[PDB]
Ligand binder design. Sequence first.
Ligand SMILES: [Mg+2]
Ligand SMILES: [Mg+2]
Ligand SMILES: [Mg+2]
Ligand SMILES: [Mg+2]
Ligand SMILES: [Mg+2]
Ligand SMILES: [Mg+2]
Ligand SMILES: [Mg+2]
Ligand SMILES: [Mg+2]
Ligand SMILES: [Mg+2]
Ligand SMILES: [Mg+2]
Ligand SMILES: [Mg+2]
Ligand SMILES: [Mg+2]
Ligand SMILES: [Mg+2]
Ligand SMILES: [Mg+2]
Ligand SMILES: [Mg+2]
Ligand SMILES: [Mg+2]
Ligand SMILES: [Mg+2]
Ligand SMILES: [Mg+2]
Ligand SMILES: [Mg+2]
Ligand SMILES: [Mg+2]
Ligand SMILES: [Mg+2]
Ligand SMILES: [Mg+2]
Ligand SMILES: [Mg+2]
Ligand SMILES: [Mg+2]
Ligand SMILES: [Mg+2]
Ligand SMILES: [Mg+2]
Ligand SMILES: [Mg+2]
Ligand SMILES: [Mg+2]
Ligand SMILES: [Mg+2]
Lengths: 106, 127, 206, 151, 98, 96
Amino acid sequence: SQDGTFDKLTKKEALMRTRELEKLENSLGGIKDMGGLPDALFVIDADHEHIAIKEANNLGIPVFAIVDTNSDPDGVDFVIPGNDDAIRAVTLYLGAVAATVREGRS
Amino acid sequence: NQYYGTGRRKSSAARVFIKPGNGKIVINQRSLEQYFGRETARMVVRQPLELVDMVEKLDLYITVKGGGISGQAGAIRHGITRALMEYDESLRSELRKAGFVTRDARQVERKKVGLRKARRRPQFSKR
Amino acid sequence: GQKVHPNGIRLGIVKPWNSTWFANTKEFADNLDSDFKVRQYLTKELAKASVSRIVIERPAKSIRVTIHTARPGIVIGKKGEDVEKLRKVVADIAGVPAQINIAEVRKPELDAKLVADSITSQLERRVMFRRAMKRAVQNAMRLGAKGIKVEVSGRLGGAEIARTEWYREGRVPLHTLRADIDYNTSEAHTTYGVIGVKVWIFKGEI
Amino acid sequence: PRRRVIGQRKILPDPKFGSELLAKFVNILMVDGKKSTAESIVYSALETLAQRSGKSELEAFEVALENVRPTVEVKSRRVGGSTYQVPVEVRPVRRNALAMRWIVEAARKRGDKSMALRLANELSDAAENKGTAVKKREDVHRMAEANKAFA
Amino acid sequence: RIRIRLKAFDHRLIDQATAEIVETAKRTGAQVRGPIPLPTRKERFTVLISPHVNKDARDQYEIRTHLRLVDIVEPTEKTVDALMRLDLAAGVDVQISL
Amino acid sequence: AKQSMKAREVKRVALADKYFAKRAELKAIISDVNARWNAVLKLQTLPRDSSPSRQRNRCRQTGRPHGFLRKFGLSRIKVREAAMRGEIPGLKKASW
RNA sequence: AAGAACCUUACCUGGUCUUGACAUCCACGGAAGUUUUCAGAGAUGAGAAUGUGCCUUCGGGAACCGUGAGACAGGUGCUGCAUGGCUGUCGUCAGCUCGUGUUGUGAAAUGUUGGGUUAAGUCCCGCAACGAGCGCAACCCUUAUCCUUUGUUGCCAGCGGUCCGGCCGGGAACUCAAAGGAGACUGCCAGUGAUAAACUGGAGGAAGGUGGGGAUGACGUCAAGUCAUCAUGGCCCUUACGACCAGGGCUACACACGUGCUACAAUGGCGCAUACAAAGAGAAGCGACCUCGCGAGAGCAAGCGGACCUCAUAAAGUGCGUCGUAGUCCGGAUUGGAGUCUGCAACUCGACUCCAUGAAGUCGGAAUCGCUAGUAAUCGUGGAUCAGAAUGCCACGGUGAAUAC
Ligand SMILES: [Mg+2]
Ligand SMILES: [Mg+2]
Ligand SMILES: [Mg+2]
Ligand SMILES: [Mg+2]
Ligand SMILES: [Mg+2]
Ligand SMILES: [Mg+2]
Ligand SMILES: [Mg+2]
Ligand SMILES: [Mg+2]
Ligand SMILES: [Mg+2]
Ligand SMILES: [Mg+2]
Ligand SMILES: [Mg+2]
Ligand SMILES: [Mg+2]
Ligand SMILES: [Mg+2]
Ligand SMILES: [Mg+2]
Ligand SMILES: [Mg+2]
Ligand SMILES: [Mg+2]
Ligand SMILES: [Mg+2]
Ligand SMILES: [Mg+2]
Ligand SMILES: [Mg+2]
Ligand SMILES: [Mg+2]
Ligand SMILES: [Mg+2]
Ligand SMILES: [Mg+2]
Ligand SMILES: [Mg+2]
Ligand SMILES: [Mg+2]
Ligand SMILES: [Mg+2]
Ligand SMILES: [Mg+2]
Ligand SMILES: [Mg+2]
Ligand SMILES: [Mg+2]
Ligand SMILES: [Mg+2]
């Protein structure tokens, strides 16, 4: 998109290539640099991400999940009861998780 | 001076030279009426001239070959309108509206294997 | 029979002609007959030399003949005796002075004619047809060859009923005229009848 | 027709009178792609009609058409598993299309000497609304009237 | 004076061959009226493809013959000879006669 | 195709180019308007295979009598075979 | 079967041969070859002249021809229900699948379904699916516009005169020829649409929405067709199911069906005059001109391997005149006589010409076929096969519709 062949050929395919770039970024974005299966998984909503929970359990990866009163535990290694819809509540969990993980190997 | 236009219609090709003179038409060293100016397609040659008047203003010297009576007459009409660009491009506004600018691309269709001509198919029976 | 010959359809687009001489109608038929006779003798004589294609051209009442083979040393022998004998026979058949050229064929497993010839030879030696097909496909893909595809037919393994059982790998755009396909065939003469083998090999797009 | 609603093909007007309607008429009369033969027949017939009734070429021809243009016709529908004949109004262009077609068939059946004479007599009777073409219009109207129950 | 007409089965080779004749003749002499295309001949064939019956299934092949003409007008002298021994052709037919 | 039949064709060609093409004067020169005597017409005891209009013009490779093409010297199907893999110079599938 | 008088040709009746018509091997003898005669339907036997051209420690040789024994040769003989190769068909219909993942005990499912949209499994959005392949589309040929180069055998706008013929100097404009480029992209505009895909309309443009036509035929189905094009397993025959020759047949004829041509007429028949094409072929060939014949053709004899010469006058059409609705000046079958050409040979069984003859047929029952535009209909022209021979097949152009609510 910067150094390779983008302006070559017509514009239609260039529009197609850029359009597909946007699609791939949206679907698999901040995962591109992971380069291997994780060793922990944090979820915001257990019921809404049951597919992700099942995959982690299949691969034997620890799972931390925020579960609401309508969610299903026993697919979660570390259950965290609480609201998972309110933006304020979600921001609180993410900030705390972001802070605690920042202290890495030190 | 002379102004030129080619014109073509289904295997016919014209060559028209229009001059700002009298109102006579000569085709293949013959008069319009003598050539086909009374028989079929008499007026299609004149058609682009009733639009944007001619009266006696323009003299036409034309040579055409190939095709038939209607094909040649159509080629002449296309050439004349093509050559009528002597009066700049202000005429194409209404010549195109009339439909003389477009070249009619309607060649005869080649015949196919299994068919008797182009699209006619041999009679079919079940039993 | 519902597919066009992949080589013939691309003759003027990507593939070249195997004969490049010019002639009038007076000797057009005679040249064709002479070309057929040289090819049949030459391909019979060089059976063990792994010969891909024979290109014949006739400049100035002469005949050149170019042999594409994967075993040039065996074709040419010690220095030039056997190749010399070939030129003598070819000149005799063609009735004009004859040249001869040897073209090396690197990567014989990318040439369909050689691949098909290898498979048919194995079949006549009672090799399992499935094993031969898999081996040809896998080692061709091992060296470029984006689109190997192979096919066999008839009395497979001595069965009483014929079947085809083809097998492809990669991509083989047969409908793309731009594509560079290298189709060719061969026949095996096992004790139970004839087994036909077809090979498609797809290479760079243009 | 199943999918693609289509446009319309243009025809040039008649050389002698410059009318599209008359140009369509010669097309209906034409056979084997002989337009010069057809236009010759029509012009001869029109001239005979004009001198017969005075009037004029176009006006006499139009008067004849007005006595043969249909207004309603039947059409099998077959909705509920039974065959009906529901009357339907006729599109304005289809009117003269049927009128011109009917006139030509009447002329072809008429047993005079020349086609031009046949055509001149046929549409002359149409002007006085007593020809076979007029009879055809009356039958179509009468049949549609009988089936007026369906609509 | 001297006329050379070339025939071949593809236009790519004929154009290369004629250009060689033009440049060598122009270099070693004069004139050269320039290549002239002349009409192409298209010879068509139709053949049944089935070994038995099936009359309506057939292929249609054709051979296309290209033509050219140089028409050099100075016999010169160091030309006619140089024009010889310049075949270097493997599929284009050259007629040298006037 | 019944090599006997192919053997017949070669014999017919051999006779045709031996007797006729030089004895064509027999039917060409004499059988004209000299002024005659019909002794020449009696002189048609030649093998009867010397007549050029007695060869069937078979395919060069298979020898089948039908579907022949003069330019290539082959039958319709054999031409296609060769055409599809090169051989016939300049020949390609046609469309227009 | 892109062309059965002989041949082709297999089939029938007779007359013949047996290592053979076709191929290799061994031995023996002889160059090869050429001119004539007899018997025979011929195949084949019998003879007579003529020729003897190529190597050589030489039991023999190289090309060529006869005789003898074997190994063999030969088969259009059977099995397309043993096969390869090739082909039809559903169908140029838009579908058919796989890897990994996931669901189910499992056959399997998902993906490939759903909301829109497209000619399209075309595209966008959504979605336990994520990707990929064969298909669709594009790349190929041709046609429609323009530009550059080249300009003869093709062309003639502007100039000179001319036999008024581009004919002739001359000209490179134009037509054209054939190589290389430009051009069409929903690209631009307005509206609709989840703001997406896309759709409707407009401008421009030769061309507008995959511009027209062609080639291109997925996985598979019908034990579909072909052992007779060829190849091929098995089986079968081997003084015969092989091989040669003459004549006959494949062309029969109480009938039935398919596909076509020509008609039944006045939108026409006939007579006279006259205008406008495209695309092809030609050396065992196309065959000007001129003379002869009513004609098919014959004699003499240029040119052309061909933008040059020949085939080769396009016909419908257009002007006049006549026919006046009749089984006719419609129709041309059938038959008699007389001829031409090809071919060794036109009886069975060729094509065409001249004179005469002048059937049925007055628009066709039940039923049934093709076609959406340069199409149908109608009118001519060329080619392959081919000594000779199309109403068939494959191509070319002229005139040119009706109708899709
Ligand atoms: Mg096909
Ligand atoms: Mg030619
Ligand atoms: Mg055989
Ligand atoms: Mg013959
Ligand atoms: Mg016979
Ligand atoms: Mg017998
Ligand atoms: Mg089968
Ligand atoms: Mg499971
Ligand atoms: Mg599906
Ligand atoms: Mg499924
Ligand atoms: Mg859908
Ligand atoms: Mg797709
Ligand atoms: Mg989906
Ligand atoms: Mg496609
Ligand atoms: Mg002048
Ligand atoms: Mg528009
Ligand atoms: Mg079967
Ligand atoms: Mg079938
Ligand atoms: Mg059989
Ligand atoms: Mg016989
Ligand atoms: Mg028969
Ligand atoms: Mg008559
Ligand atoms: Mg009767
Ligand atoms: Mg009558
Ligand atoms: Mg359609
Ligand atoms: Mg016709
Ligand atoms: Mg011919
Ligand atoms: Mg013939
Ligand atoms: Mg036509």
